Amino acid sequence: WWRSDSLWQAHDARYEADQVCVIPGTAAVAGITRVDEPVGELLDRFEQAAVDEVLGAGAXXXXXXXXXXXXXXXXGPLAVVLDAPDVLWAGRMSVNPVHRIAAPXXXXXXXXXXXXXXXXXXXXXXXXXXXXXXXXXXXXXXXXX
Amino acid sequence: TPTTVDAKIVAAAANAGHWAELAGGGQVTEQIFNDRIAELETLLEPGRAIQFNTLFLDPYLWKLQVGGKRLVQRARQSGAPIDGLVVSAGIPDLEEAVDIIDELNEVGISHVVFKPGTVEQIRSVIRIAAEVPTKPVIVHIEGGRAGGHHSWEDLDDLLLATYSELRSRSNITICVGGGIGTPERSAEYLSGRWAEVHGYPLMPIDGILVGTAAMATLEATTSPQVKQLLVETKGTEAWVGAGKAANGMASGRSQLGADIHEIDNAASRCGRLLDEVAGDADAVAERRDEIIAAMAQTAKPYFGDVAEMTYLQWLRRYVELAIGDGNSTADTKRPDSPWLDITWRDRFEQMLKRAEARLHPQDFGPIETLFDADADGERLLEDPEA
Numbered sequence: 001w002w003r004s005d006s007l008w009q010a011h012d013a014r015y016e017a018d019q020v021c022v023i024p025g026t027a028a029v030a031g032i033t034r035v036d037e038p039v040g041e042l043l044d045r046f047e048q049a050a051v052d053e054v055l056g057a058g059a060x061x062x063x064x065x066x067x068x069x070x071x072x073x074x075x076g077p078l079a080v081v082l083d084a085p086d087v088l089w090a091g092r093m094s095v096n097p098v099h100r101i102a103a104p105x106x107x108x109x110x111x112x113x114x115x116x117x118x119x120x121x122x123x124x125x126x127x128x129x130x131x132x133x134x135x136x137x138x139x140x141x142x143x144x145x
Numbered sequence: 146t147p148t149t150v151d152a153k154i155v156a157a158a159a160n161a162g163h164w165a166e167l168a169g170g171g172q173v174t175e176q177i178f179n180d181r182i183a184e185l186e187t188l189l190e191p192g193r194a195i196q197f198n199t200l201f202l203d204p205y206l207w208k209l210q211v212g213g214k215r216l217v218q219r220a221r222q223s224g225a226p227i228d229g230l231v232v233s234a235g236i237p238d239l240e241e242a243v244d245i246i247d248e249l250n251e252v253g254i255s256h257v258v259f260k261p262g263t264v265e266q267i268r269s270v271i272r273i274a275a276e277v278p279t280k281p282v283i284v285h286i287e288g289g290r291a292g293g294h295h296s297w298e299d300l301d302d303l304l305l306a307t308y309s310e311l312r313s314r315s316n317i318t319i320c321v322g323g324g325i326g327t328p329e330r331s332a333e334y335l336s337g338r339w340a341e342v343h344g345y346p347l348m349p350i351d352g353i354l355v356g357t358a359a360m361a362t363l364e365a366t367t368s369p370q371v372k373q374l375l376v377e378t379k380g381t382e383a384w385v386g387a388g389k390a391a392n393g394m395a396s397g398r399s400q401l402g403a404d405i406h407e408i409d410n411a412a413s414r415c416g417r418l419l420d421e422v423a424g425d426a427d428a429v430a431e432r433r434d435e436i437i438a439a440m441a442q443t444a445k446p447y448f449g450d451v452a453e454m455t456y457l458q459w460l461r462r463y464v465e466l467a468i469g470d471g472n473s474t475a476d477t478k479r480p481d482s483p484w485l486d487i488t489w490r491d492r493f494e495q496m497l498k499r500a501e502a503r504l505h506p507q508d509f510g511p512i513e514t515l516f517d518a519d520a521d522g523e524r525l526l527e528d529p530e531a
């Protein structure tokens with residue numbers, strides 16, 4: 001009777017909060033000081049200071065950090081097609097057809113590998129991928145003609 | 146459970162560009178939980194994706210999960226944004242884990258999440274990893290220094306011993322968690338420098354989870370007074386065995402006997418009394434005066450003397466406890482808040498209808514046929530005093 005459903009009073013309750021079971025951890029509490037600090041701030045605070053510590057010693061103003069403020073990338077259009085397993089259509093998530101296009105294809109062709117802009121990946125399933133209008137990646141599949 | 150159950154915070158955390166797990170301990174049905182995902186996907190901006198957390202503890206939830214997993218299956222068969230599943234409090238057996246991994250929603254699962262608490266539990270997941278070597282498995286290694294569900298197992302020694310075998314599987318993503326509020330203290334586990342204190346060569350980690358430090362956050366539904374309470378609590382170094390409130394933190398056992406880390410400074414009355422009552426139950430009748438008054442101190446009120454108490458006092462006590470004046474249950478019903486107590490309002494009705502059932506000498510024609518009408522009865526309900 002005492003312990004049942006004791007976790008909900010910590011949220012949206014006007015009652016004295018010294019009567020309530022509220023759940024922290026022991027050692028993590030020390031790291032808890034700032035109150036009503038947005039989630040985005042705390043999680044970034046972790047990432048941003050982890051970056052700085054990694055940057056300063058080993059990286060020392062790395063090309064990766066400089067490329068970011070200047071907008072340069074890893075995994076360009078050709079890689080992105082072969083990387084992300086999820087293919088979005090509207091608000092729905094689908095599996096990457098290239099996963100089933102790449103290997104199962106009888107004849108698979110990667111056109112102009114080292115050159116990014118002209119890069120093309122085609123298959124005997126009749127599915128071909130190329131880039132158009134910069135960031136837009138164009139996948140072209142065909143049935144018969 | 147309390148924190149991430151709100152669709153608002155898990156969305157806001159994801160909209161900040163971060164991975165998060167929607168709590169399942171606050172959702173008792175497929176339908177009620179499907180509302181949350183719908184509220185999530187609405188607050189989810191384009192493309193953004195979240196995961197789900199489930200508990201192994203009791204059979205009813207595991208039977209509910211059969212409907213729950215098929216709900217997750219149906220959702221992702223419909224193409225739902227939720228990209229992961231988290232099994233908690235225990236590690237499913239191989240045949241149980243294979244099912245989860247191989248579900249119709251599998252691609253939408255994209256990885257499976259397990260939380261080993263013991264050396265044996267770790268070795269169990271390794272066997273789940275070798276089961277499907279091509280399926281990503283994120284192994285979150287927690288402590289008992291963590292919050293909520295507890296354990297007697299050290300943070301280091303477990304990971305210290307089992308790390309080598311964990312790295313023989315490429316599909317295993319090692320994630321250390323517990324007792325971490327900051328990037329600075331958690332940086333050494335990432336570099337692998339943390340194992341050097343124990344003499345073991347560098348032992349890097351792939352990821353880090355923060356449970357506790359995110360509770361005082363702005364978008365969290367934690368009450369203003371409760372947040373201030375979590376704050377003023379002083380923290381500690383490596384957990385100590387001696388029974389006490391330790392840095393505003395003392396362990397306590399749930400109804401099933403498993404320990405729970407709760408705040409014993411912010412609230413000192415519930416936890417310590419519970420330990421008193423627990424260790425004291427043979428002679429409870431003798432300490433009854435001491436025990437029954439302490440329930441009233443923590444606001445777990447018994448009723449005034451049961452016989453002598455007037456039916457009003459009965460019916461007025463339920464209204465007192467169930468109906469908040471500040472939140473205005475009538476005004477609480479209009480937004481359609483999930484905090485709605487409606488079973489409590491239905492509880493009070495069955496008591497009211499019992500009162501008419503108890504005192505009426507006649508055929509019960511006039512009274513019962515009135516209060517039972519929808520339009521009539523619901524209007525009578527929103528006005529408890531009347």
Ligand SMILES: Cc1cc2nc3c(=O)[nH]c(=O)nc-3n(C[C@H](O)[C@H](O)[C@H](O)COP(=O)(O)O)c2cc1C
Pocket residue numbers: 023024025026028146147148168170198200232233234260287290291292293294322323324325326354355356357358
């Ligand atoms: C209020 C609260 C509720 C929690 N609920 C669950 C849960 O339902 N399932 C679970 O596996 N872990 C749960 N946890 C544990 C966290 O998922 C995480 O493992 C732990 O909090 C990390 O340790 P730390 O917060 O002390 O750093 C909960 C923790 C807290 C504080």
